[PDB]
């Protein structure tokens, strides 16, 4: 599983 | 599992 | 699990 | 487990 | 376990 | 296990 | 278990 | 078990 | 065991 805030 | 805030 | 905070 | 604050 | 903080 | 303050 | 203030 | 102060 | 004051 990948989360990633931008 | 990864999570990253930016 | 990797977590960073930026 | 790795956890990084920046 | 690593936690570094920054 | 390692901690690290900076 | 290393442990460093700085 | 190894703990610095600095 | 280590402890060292700086």
């Known amino acids: ?3 990633v805030y931008k």
Do not use: A, N, P, R
């Open 1 to 3: 599983v990948q989360i």
